[PDB]
Amino acid sequence: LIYGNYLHLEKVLNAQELQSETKGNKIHDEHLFIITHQAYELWFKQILWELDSVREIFQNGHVRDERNMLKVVSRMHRVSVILKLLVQQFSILETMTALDFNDFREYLSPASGFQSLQFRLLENKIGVLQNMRVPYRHYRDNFKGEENELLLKSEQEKTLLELVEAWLERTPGLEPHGFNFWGKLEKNITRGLEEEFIRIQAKEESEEKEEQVAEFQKQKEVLLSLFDEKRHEHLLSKGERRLSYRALQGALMIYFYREEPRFQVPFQLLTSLMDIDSLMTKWRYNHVCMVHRMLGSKGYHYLRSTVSDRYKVFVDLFNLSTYLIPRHWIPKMNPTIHKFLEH
Amino acid sequence: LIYGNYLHLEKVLNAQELQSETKGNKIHDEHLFIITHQAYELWFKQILWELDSVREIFQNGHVRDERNMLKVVSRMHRVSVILKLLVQQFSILETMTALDFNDFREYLSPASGFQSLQFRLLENKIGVLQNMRVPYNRRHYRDNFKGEENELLLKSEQEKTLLELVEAWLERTPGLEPHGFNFWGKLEKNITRGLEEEFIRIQAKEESEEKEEQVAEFQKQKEVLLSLFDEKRHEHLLSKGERRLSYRALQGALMIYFYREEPRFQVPFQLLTSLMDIDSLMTKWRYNHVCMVHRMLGSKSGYHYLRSTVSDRYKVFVDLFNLSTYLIPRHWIPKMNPTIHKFLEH
Amino acid sequence: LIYGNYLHLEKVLNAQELQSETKGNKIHDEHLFIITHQAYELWFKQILWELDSVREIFQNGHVRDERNMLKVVSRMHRVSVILKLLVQQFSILETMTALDFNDFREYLSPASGFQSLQFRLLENKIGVLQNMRVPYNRRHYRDNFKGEENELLLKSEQEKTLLELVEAWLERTPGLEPHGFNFWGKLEKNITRGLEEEFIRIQAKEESEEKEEQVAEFQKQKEVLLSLFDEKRHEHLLSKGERRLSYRALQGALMIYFYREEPRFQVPFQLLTSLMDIDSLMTKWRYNHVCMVHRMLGSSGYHYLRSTVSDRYKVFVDLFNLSTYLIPRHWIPKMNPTIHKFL
Amino acid sequence: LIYGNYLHLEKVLNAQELQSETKGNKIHDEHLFIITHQAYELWFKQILWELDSVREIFQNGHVRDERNMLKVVSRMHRVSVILKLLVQQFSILETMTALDFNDFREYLSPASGFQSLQFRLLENKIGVLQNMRVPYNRRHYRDNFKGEENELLLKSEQEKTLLELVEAWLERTPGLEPHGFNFWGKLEKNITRGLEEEFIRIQAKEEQVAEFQKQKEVLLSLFDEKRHEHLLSKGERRLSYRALQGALMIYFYREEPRFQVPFQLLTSLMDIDSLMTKWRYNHVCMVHRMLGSGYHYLRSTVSDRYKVFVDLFNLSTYLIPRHWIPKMNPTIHKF
Ligand code: HEM
Ligand code: HEM
Ligand code: HEM
Ligand code: HEM
Ligand SMILES: c1ccc2c(-c3ccc4nnn(CN5CCNC5)c4c3)c[nH]c2c1
Ligand SMILES: c1ccc2c(-c3ccc4nnn(CN5CCNC5)c4c3)c[nH]c2c1
Ligand SMILES: c1ccc2c(-c3ccc4nnn(CN5CCNC5)c4c3)c[nH]c2c1
Ligand SMILES: c1ccc2c(-c3ccc4nnn(CN5CCNC5)c4c3)c[nH]c2c1
Ligand SMILES: C[C@](N)(Cc1c[nH]c2ccccc12)C(=O)O
Ligand SMILES: C[C@](N)(Cc1c[nH]c2ccccc12)C(=O)O
Ligand SMILES: C[C@](N)(Cc1c[nH]c2ccccc12)C(=O)O
Ligand SMILES: C[C@](N)(Cc1c[nH]c2ccccc12)C(=O)O
């Protein structure tokens, strides 16, 4: 077994054909453009391999055995390490000037990044919604045959978002007849808000007091909005939220009780999911900046639109920031109950 | 023309075969091991493409036309930007534990990075000398190769290296002509005079240990600075491989260093900077590779051979680094007032 | 002379006071928050030092001596290397969770990064125009400052900016003289001819959608390319602040772009490249800052900050937009030996 | 409360005095040299703050409550993220040429990085042994210090190091009890059996047999407590034999819930050692670029001598087939 054979370098290193050269006008920098994209695609393949392995662990029930959480979090962390490298990799293509790009651009048409199957597969499998996608036209229209079918499978199969959702719905602590997290949280917040009101009311009529009253009212609205299941359902329908109400409860349970042993690695998983969303957005941003630098202000706009919350699959995990409360309002988990979160 | 066809993804993305899986025992992390190496090899190919284009520019004489220096420096800078990414890319393989690596390591034998053709081509073309390579198991590096591959390696050894091509170019650096600006002659005179002046200053100081120490430092510095004008010492150091550039090339490099702000030398100075950067980044690649071997295989050995590679013996442009040793006060540098500052304008 | 004295560590390392601790409730992560900002401010000071040194070189006329270009480009490159580190430095503050930030946030009011003097000085000295700044809370940014600081900010607005100093230098670019190489005249003629040639080949093309689309492209390209020679449109766009450089400076920049390989233009081209880099890296800093505000405070300051991530804050947008006016290499007026040696 | 006051910018941003300027010959790049070092020192202070908080969690017994492992690992991870930035930060000083450095180098003498108190504090608190430190020109490291600073350094030498605190914790790792899961006993047995099995196979070529012999020596050496004690005395190992057993327990059973975050902790300790070494390497490379020849002294610092958690790295050496690992079945799975 030889290195070059093991790595199939006879394929990988014989895959570079400059269209400039095919058309009798070889342009040096075209080679960079080819290699950069091939490297992105190798890493996309690796991301898919990790992400699929993690999807399988959820879908086949292995995640139920918490022995497997370490593997889940290491692979999701690995995805974020790769994406970080992919963001840095734009630095290489920034050594190509627009003037030099302009010398081989003609030989590329009509090929486009839009035709990256793997990038679409990755978006789909994480959980980007097609209805939420900004029109440029459809996206699969640029694909046909087996590729179009792969895309459909990726759209119909359970996404990472859906699989994490189901798992969040089973989070220990949500049972009304058990720790009854939601009931206690609602009560504690109501009481806390009542207490705060009394204090502010006790102050003497002033601009300061009014400013406090106003802030209180805002905080109150936000915190209480959390317990409005109907508003959540409405916001789901508009696609401004993605997780079921019960999954949201599970996520918040993990956030508030992150230090409890059974929740430590789950918390890291939630953190990694947010990281992946952020890094995917950063990839899109750098790509936009690159298109602009090469093609000029007039694609740029469409791609700019992709840098938005509509492409953030785990927006709900980010938005749990909005519902931070004083620590002493969090329902206490005394050791008496702590046992259910021990292992 | 479609993306996947343009990039030949039918080759690139059908090149991943896990030996663990071929032998009926698929190990998840083997996939990462394969892709990481394939990405390194794509970027090695790109480095070779840039490096070869720059070698050609020197070898065919195009570098004589100073209009081409921008392209030369952009491409060498590009090589350093890629290498920096290659150093960062070790962070990905650090997400594989040694325990997990141990589950598929058996299926890899006897394949090894030693068999990376492109890595050897890159070392050769930059200018790593065969006689200066550390032997592994008392064997030649090329003995691991055969056929066309062995022949490519020979070509890479026999064709002009970047070191040789830069050498020739440095030897023609304007300002070295005895009949012209006569840089070396003036430099020797100014340093001798400067050393004399410095001796007088120190000797004028009140007898004190500080003075005694300054005396000691002076004596050291004098020996170093004067050693620069000893062409025989240089030849000796060449023979030992502690230097690599010809004496005259060294003069050219120093000319560029001291007169870097003169228009004609601004981009040449950046070139010299980039060559040092490439050497530093190559060394950092080797270091990170060694640390990786250790974390996976443990101490003992390839480890020790690889550690030997992390050294000045593998730094082709070591001479460019070592010109630091011969820094002098700015006022000792032979003056180039516009009267004589004419040949360094574009 | 001792290290700690040379670096005044008696000041630097006695500058960390946790407000949480001052108020009897020390929160561990507040220390990180303090150090991170102090490090940003050290580097802002270094950027100001480089940028001011470069402004002086322009303003006092030293830049006229082309021997000084290496130092100019090294210092601007150094600014970009620092900013790159400042972008990466967000990774440290991402190790603080929103939950932990929430434990000391109250002790910070009413301090804000908005009040960073140095950040404002930096924006001003590069050339962010006050009338182009997005209002915060329906008010001017400088209202957040008082006394000496307010006065420093005004000086920074009234003194010559990097943009203005580069502009004046670009206006003197060799090659623009009608009586000499006559770059603009020749460029207009060559583009007219090239466009005519394209039309002829297009008109000769077989009636087809391929032709129809080539027609559409041609029309668009023609409009863009000819718009370049419309000085009145430029003046209009200047007035709206959608461009920043004088028409003549734009000509100089384009001269440098097209003849970058000519010896006298090699390092000037690197300077233009670096100025774009600084704008891009400033934008990346703002983007990462926004993403971090969102992660900690949730979903406004957020919306104001998002507004800052835009072309209004790109001082050298005109250097980016010269991509838009890329022409085939053969259209570029020839610089043969006869009229070569001047560069 | 105003930003500049909250951050004490009246101190931080009035701490830049160029000696070149003090001596009537201002050199532009000296400013970069000062700021770079000040930034390093701010971050060293932050690393000390994290590291001390973690040492305290061990020393006050809070680590015993496994609820605190997330905080321990987050802060150690934070240390690694800072060190990574500190490695990248050399890129800034690489924008200073040696020629430009040479214009102000004279005004610096005799100041040196050797006099960085915080760097020494950091080395000490992690667990770099003084007896293992390479001497520079036959001089003690503390010789460069005096007064309260010298006293801080002594405290940092005499107080419990991160290494010692982790050691004690590793010694209490569940599973080592002979009367319980009896990890060590079972591991020794399984390895012996496996080696015997391998013998038989090869007997059933000799080139490979040679390697088998080597593996046996390595694997069996693990169970030689006396060799370990000897190597401890020479400072080629640092952890007690029992701590080593705990670490190996965590390595082999990393997926067991109670060991998942502990495994991450061990990983991060190795990361900190690696990153510290990388910092030293980049610093060496920098000295060489500017002075061109303590280049060789600094090179000596880039060694296993300065790797506090070398034992954690070396557990790679003792990897065995998965099926030799004593099984953690329901019988014992409970713990
Ligand atoms: C010279 C550099 C680049 C230019 C000028 C460029 C140009 C474009 C343009 C204009 C689009 C919008 C679709 C279209 O009109 O064709 C696009 C989309 C895309 N590009 Fe690039 N691109 C560049 C580099 C890259 C790189 C390095 C990647 C990495 C694989 C890439 C992957 C993509 C992908 C996946 C899309 C679709 C993204 C989406 O729809 O959200 N491109 N590119
Ligand atoms: C698990 C990670 C790795 C291990 C354990 C490893 C192991 C080794 C070993 C032991 C050697 C010495 C030759 C031998 O005895 O076989 C070697 C050399 C080499 N490896 Fe790796 N390697 C790793 C990753 C990589 C990667 C990612 C590359 C990238 C292409 C690579 C490229 C090379 C090269 C080019 C050499 C020869 C270098 C020289 O002779 O100076 N290795 N590797
Ligand atoms: C926990 C981390 C951070 C949060 C939550 C945060 C929050 C904010 C907010 C809300 C604003 C808008 C003004 C306001 O309403 O107060 C702002 C502006 C700003 N922050 Fe931060 N910030 C953080 C970290 C940083 C850091 C590390 C820097 C570094 C110096 C910084 C510098 C600034 C600057 C300069 C502005 C003004 C930006 C502009 O007008 O474009 N912030 N920040
Ligand atoms: C121009 C760049 C630099 C040069 C030339 C330089 C030079 C030196 C030299 C020669 C030594 C050996 C002791 C001596 O003889 O003085 C040393 C040690 C040291 N330097 Fe630097 N240094 C540089 C940058 C830095 C930076 C950025 C740091 C960061 C704070 C730093 C911190 C240290 C430390 C802590 C030591 C002690 C190392 C040890 O004993 O392990 N130096 N430096
Ligand atoms: C592979 C091949 C091409 C690309 C591009 C890319 C960038 C700029 C372009 N300008 N024209 N074209 C050709 N067609 C795009 C859609 N219609 C015309 C470009 C293609 C980016 N990534 C690529 C990967
Ligand atoms: C391709 C294939 C293998 C490698 C290795 C590598 C790493 C660790 C190894 N342990 N044993 N082997 C097998 N051979 C090494 C020398 N003779 C037996 C390993 C190979 C590194 N890069 C690779 C690329
Ligand atoms: C120093 C001190 C504070 C900050 C902030 C910051 C972050 C979150 C905040 N929430 N409230 N405040 C108070 N201000 C908000 C508007 N005016 C009062 C915060 C301040 C960011 N960087 C800082 C540096
Ligand atoms: C603060 C101040 C100085 C430094 C140095 C440094 C770098 C190069 C030097 N050359 N001489 N000196 C002064 N003495 C050091 C020992 N013998 C002479 C230098 C000091 C590195 N980091 C610093 C931080
Ligand atoms: C048995 C279980 N692993 C319980 C579970 C579900 N979601 C969680 C989140 C955090 C911690 C535990 C869980 C399962 O049902 O998967
Ligand atoms: C005409 C010339 N380009 C001269 C030359 C040689 N080396 C240099 C270094 C710096 C500046 C100029 C040169 C040539 O002979 O290549
Ligand atoms: C003599 C000159 N340095 C000419 C000049 C102006 N702008 C330029 C741009 C690129 C190259 C040269 C110039 C000066 O007037 O400053
Ligand atoms: C009760 C205990 N937390 C047990 C313990 C010690 N070391 C460990 C390593 C991994 C897992 C658990 C432990 C303690 O004594 O700290």
GROMACS .gro file of N, CA and C in nm, chain A residues 1 3 6-8 11-17 19 26 28-32 34-38 41-43 45-46 49-50 53 75 78 88 92 95-96 107-108 110-112 115-116 118, chain B residues 1 3 6-8 11-17 19 26 28-32 34-39 41-43 45-46 49-50 53 75 78 88 92 95 107-108 110-112 115-116 118:
model
  276
    1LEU      N    1   0.086  -0.122   0.000
    1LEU     CA    2   0.000   0.000   0.000
    1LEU      C    3   0.089   0.125   0.000
    3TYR      N    4   0.129   0.552  -0.045
    3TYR     CA    5   0.063   0.678  -0.010
    3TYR      C    6  -0.030   0.725  -0.121
    6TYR      N    7  -0.316   0.497  -0.174
    6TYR     CA    8  -0.408   0.496  -0.062
    6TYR      C    9  -0.497   0.621  -0.074
    7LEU      N   10  -0.438   0.735  -0.108
    7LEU     CA   11  -0.512   0.861  -0.117
    7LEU      C   12  -0.572   0.885  -0.256
    8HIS      N   13  -0.555   0.791  -0.350
    8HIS     CA   14  -0.607   0.803  -0.486
    8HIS      C   15  -0.565   0.936  -0.549
   11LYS      N   16  -0.634   1.035  -0.901
   11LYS     CA   17  -0.755   1.110  -0.930
   11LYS      C   18  -0.742   1.256  -0.885
   12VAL      N   19  -0.700   1.277  -0.761
   12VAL     CA   20  -0.706   1.409  -0.697
   12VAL      C   21  -0.612   1.507  -0.768
   13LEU      N   22  -0.495   1.459  -0.811
   13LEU     CA   23  -0.393   1.545  -0.868
   13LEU      C   24  -0.391   1.539  -1.021
   14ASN      N   25  -0.491   1.475  -1.081
   14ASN     CA   26  -0.514   1.484  -1.224
   14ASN      C   27  -0.656   1.535  -1.251
   15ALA      N   28  -0.696   1.640  -1.178
   15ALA     CA   29  -0.832   1.693  -1.184
   15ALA      C   30  -0.830   1.843  -1.212
   16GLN      N   31  -0.714   1.892  -1.255
   16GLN     CA   32  -0.692   2.034  -1.272
   16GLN      C   33  -0.678   2.064  -1.422
   17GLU      N   34  -0.785   2.113  -1.484
   17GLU     CA   35  -0.783   2.151  -1.624
   17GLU      C   36  -0.827   2.297  -1.636
   19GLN      N   37  -0.962   2.597  -1.818
   19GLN     CA   38  -1.040   2.627  -1.936
   19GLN      C   39  -0.968   2.731  -2.022
   26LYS      N   40  -0.387   3.018  -2.178
   26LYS     CA   41  -0.361   2.980  -2.041
   26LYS      C   42  -0.337   3.104  -1.954
   28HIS      N   43  -0.246   3.206  -1.558
   28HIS     CA   44  -0.176   3.142  -1.448
   28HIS      C   45  -0.271   3.124  -1.330
   29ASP      N   46  -0.344   3.231  -1.293
   29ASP     CA   47  -0.422   3.234  -1.171
   29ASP      C   48  -0.545   3.144  -1.180
   30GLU      N   49  -0.583   3.096  -1.300
   30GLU     CA   50  -0.698   3.007  -1.305
   30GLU      C   51  -0.672   2.883  -1.219
   31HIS      N   52  -0.545   2.843  -1.209
   31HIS     CA   53  -0.510   2.721  -1.139
   31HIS      C   54  -0.545   2.735  -0.992
   32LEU      N   55  -0.517   2.851  -0.933
   32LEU     CA   56  -0.552   2.883  -0.796
   32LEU      C   57  -0.703   2.871  -0.774
   34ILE      N   58  -0.919   2.692  -0.935
   34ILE     CA   59  -0.960   2.553  -0.938
   34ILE      C   60  -0.928   2.484  -0.805
   35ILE      N   61  -0.805   2.497  -0.758
   35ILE     CA   62  -0.757   2.424  -0.642
   35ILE      C   63  -0.835   2.469  -0.519
   36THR      N   64  -0.855   2.601  -0.505
   36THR     CA   65  -0.927   2.653  -0.392
   36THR      C   66  -1.065   2.588  -0.383
   37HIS      N   67  -1.138   2.582  -0.494
   37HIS     CA   68  -1.272   2.522  -0.493
   37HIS      C   69  -1.266   2.373  -0.462
   38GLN      N   70  -1.166   2.303  -0.519
   38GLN     CA   71  -1.154   2.161  -0.493
   38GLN      C   72  -1.128   2.137  -0.343
   41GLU      N   73  -1.450   2.177  -0.156
   41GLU     CA   74  -1.533   2.058  -0.178
   41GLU      C   75  -1.485   1.934  -0.101
   42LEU      N   76  -1.354   1.913  -0.089
   42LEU     CA   77  -1.304   1.807  -0.003
   42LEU      C   78  -1.356   1.826   0.139
   43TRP      N   79  -1.345   1.947   0.191
   43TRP     CA   80  -1.387   1.974   0.327
   43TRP      C   81  -1.540   1.969   0.343
   45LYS      N   82  -1.722   1.759   0.182
   45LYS     CA   83  -1.744   1.614   0.189
   45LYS      C   84  -1.720   1.565   0.332
   46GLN      N   85  -1.615   1.615   0.397
   46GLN     CA   86  -1.585   1.576   0.533
   46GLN      C   87  -1.693   1.625   0.630
   49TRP      N   88  -1.981   1.401   0.605
   49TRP     CA   89  -1.953   1.272   0.666
   49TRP      C   90  -1.975   1.280   0.817
   50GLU      N   91  -1.925   1.386   0.880
   50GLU     CA   92  -1.945   1.404   1.022
   50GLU      C   93  -2.094   1.425   1.052
   53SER      N   94  -2.308   1.120   1.018
   53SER     CA   95  -2.283   1.026   1.126
   53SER      C   96  -2.359   1.070   1.251
   75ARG      N   97  -1.759   1.537   1.722
   75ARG     CA   98  -1.780   1.550   1.579
   75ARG      C   99  -1.841   1.685   1.542
   78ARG      N  100  -1.567   1.921   1.565
   78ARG     CA  101  -1.481   1.902   1.451
   78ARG      C  102  -1.538   1.979   1.331
   88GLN      N  103  -1.088   3.097   0.702
   88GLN     CA  104  -0.951   3.144   0.685
   88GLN      C  105  -0.904   3.123   0.541
   92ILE      N  106  -0.650   3.294   0.088
   92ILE     CA  107  -0.570   3.252  -0.025
   92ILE      C  108  -0.624   3.317  -0.153
   95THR      N  109  -0.536   3.666  -0.257
   95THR     CA  110  -0.410   3.700  -0.323
   95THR      C  111  -0.430   3.704  -0.475
   96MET      N  112  -0.551   3.674  -0.526
   96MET     CA  113  -0.580   3.694  -0.668
   96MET      C  114  -0.646   3.830  -0.687
  107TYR      N  115  -1.396   3.228  -1.960
  107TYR     CA  116  -1.390   3.086  -1.992
  107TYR      C  117  -1.469   3.004  -1.891
  108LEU      N  118  -1.520   3.067  -1.784
  108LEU     CA  119  -1.589   2.996  -1.678
  108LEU      C  120  -1.739   2.986  -1.709
  110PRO      N  121  -2.099   2.910  -1.837
  110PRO     CA  122  -2.188   2.961  -1.734
  110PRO      C  123  -2.178   2.892  -1.598
  111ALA      N  124  -2.064   2.828  -1.569
  111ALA     CA  125  -2.047   2.756  -1.444
  111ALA      C  126  -2.062   2.852  -1.326
  112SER      N  127  -2.118   2.802  -1.214
  112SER     CA  128  -2.144   2.887  -1.099
  112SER      C  129  -2.130   2.807  -0.970
  115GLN      N  130  -2.393   2.574  -0.834
  115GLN     CA  131  -2.398   2.435  -0.877
  115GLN      C  132  -2.321   2.345  -0.779
  116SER      N  133  -2.274   2.398  -0.666
  116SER     CA  134  -2.218   2.312  -0.561
  116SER      C  135  -2.329   2.229  -0.497
  118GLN      N  136  -2.279   1.980  -0.293
  118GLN     CA  137  -2.249   1.947  -0.155
  118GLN      C  138  -2.286   2.061  -0.061
  344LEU      N  139  -2.090   2.439  -1.953
  344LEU     CA  140  -1.986   2.412  -1.850
  344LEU      C  141  -2.047   2.419  -1.710
  346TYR      N  142  -2.025   2.340  -1.281
  346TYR     CA  143  -1.929   2.350  -1.171
  346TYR      C  144  -1.853   2.219  -1.151
  349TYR      N  145  -1.632   2.137  -1.436
  349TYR     CA  146  -1.521   2.229  -1.447
  349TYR      C  147  -1.414   2.188  -1.347
  350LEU      N  148  -1.454   2.154  -1.223
  350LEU     CA  149  -1.360   2.119  -1.118
  350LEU      C  150  -1.324   1.970  -1.116
  351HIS      N  151  -1.377   1.890  -1.208
  351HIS     CA  152  -1.352   1.746  -1.214
  351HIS      C  153  -1.380   1.680  -1.079
  354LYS      N  154  -1.365   1.314  -1.022
  354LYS     CA  155  -1.240   1.256  -0.974
  354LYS      C  156  -1.217   1.286  -0.825
  355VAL      N  157  -1.230   1.415  -0.787
  355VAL     CA  158  -1.186   1.461  -0.657
  355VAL      C  159  -1.272   1.398  -0.547
  356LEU      N  160  -1.402   1.383  -0.572
  356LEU     CA  161  -1.496   1.337  -0.470
  356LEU      C  162  -1.529   1.189  -0.486
  357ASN      N  163  -1.455   1.117  -0.572
  357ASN     CA  164  -1.459   0.972  -0.577
  357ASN      C  165  -1.319   0.915  -0.554
  358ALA      N  166  -1.246   0.972  -0.457
  358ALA     CA  167  -1.108   0.936  -0.431
  358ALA      C  168  -1.090   0.897  -0.284
  359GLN      N  169  -1.202   0.871  -0.216
  359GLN     CA  170  -1.200   0.846  -0.073
  359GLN      C  171  -1.239   0.701  -0.047
  360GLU      N  172  -1.139   0.617  -0.021
  360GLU     CA  173  -1.162   0.477   0.009
  360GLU      C  174  -1.096   0.444   0.142
  362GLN      N  175  -0.945   0.210   0.395
  362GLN     CA  176  -0.889   0.076   0.402
  362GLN      C  177  -0.955  -0.004   0.515
  369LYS      N  178  -1.491  -0.074   0.907
  369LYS     CA  179  -1.495   0.070   0.883
  369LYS      C  180  -1.474   0.147   1.013
  371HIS      N  181  -1.464   0.540   1.152
  371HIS     CA  182  -1.521   0.668   1.111
  371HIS      C  183  -1.410   0.768   1.082
  372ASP      N  184  -1.312   0.779   1.173
  372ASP     CA  185  -1.213   0.886   1.164
  372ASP      C  186  -1.116   0.865   1.049
  373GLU      N  187  -1.111   0.746   0.988
  373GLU     CA  188  -1.019   0.726   0.877
  373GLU      C  189  -1.053   0.823   0.766
  374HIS      N  190  -1.181   0.860   0.754
  374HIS     CA  191  -1.226   0.949   0.647
  374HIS      C  192  -1.156   1.084   0.659
  375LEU      N  193  -1.149   1.135   0.783
  375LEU     CA  194  -1.082   1.262   0.810
  375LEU      C  195  -0.933   1.255   0.771
  377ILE      N  196  -0.789   1.073   0.546
  377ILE     CA  197  -0.776   1.076   0.402
  377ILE      C  198  -0.794   1.217   0.349
  378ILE      N  199  -0.903   1.285   0.388
  378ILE     CA  200  -0.936   1.416   0.332
  378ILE      C  201  -0.827   1.515   0.370
  379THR      N  202  -0.781   1.511   0.495
  379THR     CA  203  -0.678   1.605   0.537
  379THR      C  204  -0.556   1.595   0.445
  380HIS      N  205  -0.508   1.471   0.417
  380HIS     CA  206  -0.392   1.452   0.331
  380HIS      C  207  -0.421   1.499   0.189
  381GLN      N  208  -0.541   1.470   0.139
  381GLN     CA  209  -0.577   1.511   0.005
  381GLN      C  210  -0.577   1.664  -0.006
  382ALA      N  211  -0.620   1.732   0.100
  382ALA     CA  212  -0.622   1.877   0.096
  382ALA      C  213  -0.478   1.930   0.096
  384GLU      N  214  -0.226   1.782  -0.028
  384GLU     CA  215  -0.168   1.753  -0.159
  384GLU      C  216  -0.220   1.850  -0.266
  385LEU      N  217  -0.349   1.886  -0.262
  385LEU     CA  218  -0.398   1.990  -0.351
  385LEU      C  219  -0.315   2.117  -0.333
  386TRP      N  220  -0.293   2.160  -0.209
  386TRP     CA  221  -0.219   2.283  -0.186
  386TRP      C  222  -0.070   2.270  -0.220
  388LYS      N  223   0.032   2.099  -0.472
  388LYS     CA  224   0.026   2.116  -0.617
  388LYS      C  225   0.022   2.264  -0.652
  389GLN      N  226  -0.056   2.343  -0.577
  389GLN     CA  227  -0.064   2.486  -0.602
  389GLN      C  228   0.069   2.555  -0.572
  392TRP      N  229   0.298   2.495  -0.854
  392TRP     CA  230   0.256   2.572  -0.969
  392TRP      C  231   0.311   2.714  -0.959
  393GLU      N  232   0.297   2.776  -0.842
  393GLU     CA  233   0.348   2.910  -0.823
  393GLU      C  234   0.501   2.909  -0.833
  396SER      N  235   0.639   2.862  -1.176
  396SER     CA  236   0.619   2.979  -1.260
  396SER      C  237   0.726   3.084  -1.228
  418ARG      N  238   0.335   3.616  -0.619
  418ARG     CA  239   0.329   3.471  -0.618
  418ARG      C  240   0.404   3.412  -0.499
  421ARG      N  241   0.192   3.468  -0.209
  421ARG     CA  242   0.084   3.370  -0.217
  421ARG      C  243   0.129   3.236  -0.160
  431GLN      N  244  -0.221   2.603   0.992
  431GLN     CA  245  -0.346   2.608   1.064
  431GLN      C  246  -0.423   2.477   1.046
  435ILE      N  247  -0.725   2.068   1.243
  435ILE     CA  248  -0.833   1.976   1.212
  435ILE      C  249  -0.796   1.835   1.256
  438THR      N  250  -0.833   1.717   1.611
  438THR     CA  251  -0.963   1.673   1.665
  438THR      C  252  -0.974   1.521   1.657
  450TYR      N  253  -0.432  -0.064   0.911
  450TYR     CA  254  -0.472  -0.081   0.772
  450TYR      C  255  -0.391   0.009   0.679
  451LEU      N  256  -0.309   0.098   0.735
  451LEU     CA  257  -0.238   0.198   0.655
  451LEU      C  258  -0.102   0.143   0.609
  453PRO      N  259   0.204  -0.034   0.449
  453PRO     CA  260   0.319   0.046   0.488
  453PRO      C  261   0.323   0.188   0.434
  454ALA      N  262   0.207   0.243   0.394
  454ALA     CA  263   0.204   0.375   0.332
  454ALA      C  264   0.254   0.481   0.431
  455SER      N  265   0.320   0.586   0.381
  455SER     CA  266   0.380   0.688   0.466
  455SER      C  267   0.390   0.819   0.389
  458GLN      N  268   0.643   0.903   0.126
  458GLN     CA  269   0.616   0.871  -0.014
  458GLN      C  270   0.541   0.985  -0.083
  459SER      N  271   0.522   1.100  -0.016
  459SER     CA  272   0.467   1.217  -0.084
  459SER      C  273   0.566   1.271  -0.187
  461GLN      N  274   0.506   1.506  -0.403
  461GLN     CA  275   0.500   1.650  -0.421
  461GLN      C  276   0.578   1.723  -0.313
   0.00000   0.00000   0.00000
